[model samples]
Target: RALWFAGVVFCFGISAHQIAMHVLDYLSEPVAVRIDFVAQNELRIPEITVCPRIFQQNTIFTDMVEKQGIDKMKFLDLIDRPEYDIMAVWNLSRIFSDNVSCSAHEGSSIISGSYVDPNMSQPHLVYTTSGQCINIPASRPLIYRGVNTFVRITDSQPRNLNQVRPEAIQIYFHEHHHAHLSRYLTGLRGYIVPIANPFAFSIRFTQINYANKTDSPCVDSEEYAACVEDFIEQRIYEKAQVQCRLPYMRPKLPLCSTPTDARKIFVATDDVIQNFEKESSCKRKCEETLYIVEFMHLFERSNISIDMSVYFAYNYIQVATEYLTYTLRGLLSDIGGVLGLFLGICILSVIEVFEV
Candidate 1:
């Protein structure tokens, strides 16, 4: 009788496993794919470019300009104060200027030209003097702000000579059309590839000449400086379209306020196929031809250091029953259940004999 009971239990376990597998087989979808870990490594961090806002209506600049008018010395003094104080003033200005009417890509920071609104906001995201430029290191994972720290390498070598002192208006020079930066960084057209160690890549900033071919009368006259400034202003607005401006979400560093947030990385793969095969001629054959454009933030607000695990490639296969329902833990649980059943039977038989 005991042997018969043991056979039944073993049979039930097999049936259960079979049923689970059958369910997975029925539910299998051709397009369903699972992301498995490939590898991890450390390497030079990528550059991140925070898109600048339109300056004319930027309240921070307007407030400073207004305050400077009220008391030039006081305003200058405030500019040299602590970084927190400066950001506070800047953020406060955003509250009022956030609602101001502005054009896309208005010339920010120092420039001279009639085409630009003189009252526009400065484009510098990190407010520092030429001497105190924000030094974002490439050693750790997130360089400056937060998750997905890769941005454009900007020239931060105090090129603006408008102010004699470094504390005046020397912003880190990472310039580009805000729209172009957004589209490539956070939009559908571009990708953020997360590379792991055993990794090989380098990041550095370079200067862009926005006013090389201006033929305006301002360029020929003493007003050439102003003309060049206007040319940059015009170019900025021309490139940044409506969809790329603020209030519309742009790429950002994760706050990483907690240990969880810091562990993840947002990788934006512009466009690529899921599966590719190489032929005899070395030409590639892409399967399914679907665009792998997606953002995966692996870690969130956490102090947990990340190993920079990257999406090397994807395995395209039918969703299997074994993959869906049966996990390592579940398998152990099944074995435990069988063993527990056998122990309970033995204990009950002994108890019955003792009672007799």
Candidate 2:
């Protein structure tokens, strides 16, 4: 009996230890976390309470005098004198047609008087000294032809004591005057100001391409007989029929019914112009600027047009959980379970010893 009781006690102790270990493990395991995914098309932007004023002619004139050693009075005379047929500051509306384009690329004019006349109905001439098409994706440089005063000055500087000739300086100033007029004219026409800042947004084009078995099998006697007749008439006909699987039936991939991406597509300020114009007659308000944005359609492979939404988000939430300390009833229950286990083991051991 003593030996039997000792063995039982030892076995019970082993079982109890395992139970305790399991309980401890259960308590230590992390709780499941709950998460949510959401999408929104409208986001709250901070109100523009204070924005910096952009027109900086004062700064520009100040820099010209301070940085270049040009005599202030002489410079003013060179630009301001009316005998040059080109006033240092002439009315932009009077000189160039709103339809002129300009470019600063090598072999291109920085600015031109191509369509400055008011009566011409041709599209505005476009120009960029940077040679980059700001709103278009074409690879060819924006080309312009006219007497490029910038090129003349640059080519003459090496031969003229490394100094711009008075004539070249006057010509360059005339071009600068054109730029100033261009800005004023753009604003007067109610177009967006010539600022570097561009609007930004996120968008996506959802596309799916899948091939499904659409051809029917030759299940009817009439169809099978017709197929047999075609096969007998021409083996090529049978091969084609099999390839098609049904009369005039073929597998097809899905079109991009709507525009969507994994989540987001991006757009810039230029993207909103024409669409806005079509919706609200806004393009009439635009002047020399082309208001097209990039990614108006899908920029990548896919023939179907995409429909997409712009997204904006305002708020988000995060959650965390922690175990509470010092719970009186819970603590007592755990201690009781442990103590009861030990006490039962001890009693069994005591009985075994007594029998021995």
TM-scores, all models, native as reference: 0.20, 0.19
> Ten residues in a row with the worst lDDT in model 1?
265-274
Q: For candidate 2, write residues 57-170 as lDDT tens digits.
A: 222333344454544322332223343211211111121222222222222324753322222122222221111011111222122232221110011012223432111000
lDDT (C-alpha) at residue 40 in model 1:
24
Across 28-137, the per-residue lDDT of candidate 1 in tens digits comes to 41233243332223222222222222223233444565655534222323334444243343343321111222111121233542122213232223221111112222
RMSD of each: 24.4, 28.8
lDDT, candidate 1, equals: 0.28
Best by TM-score: 1
**Model 2 bad stretches (over 4 Å):** 19-335, 338-356
Model 1 regions lying over 4 Å from their true place: 1-10, 17-63, 66-356
Cα displacement (angstroms), candidate 1, residue 330, comes to: 17
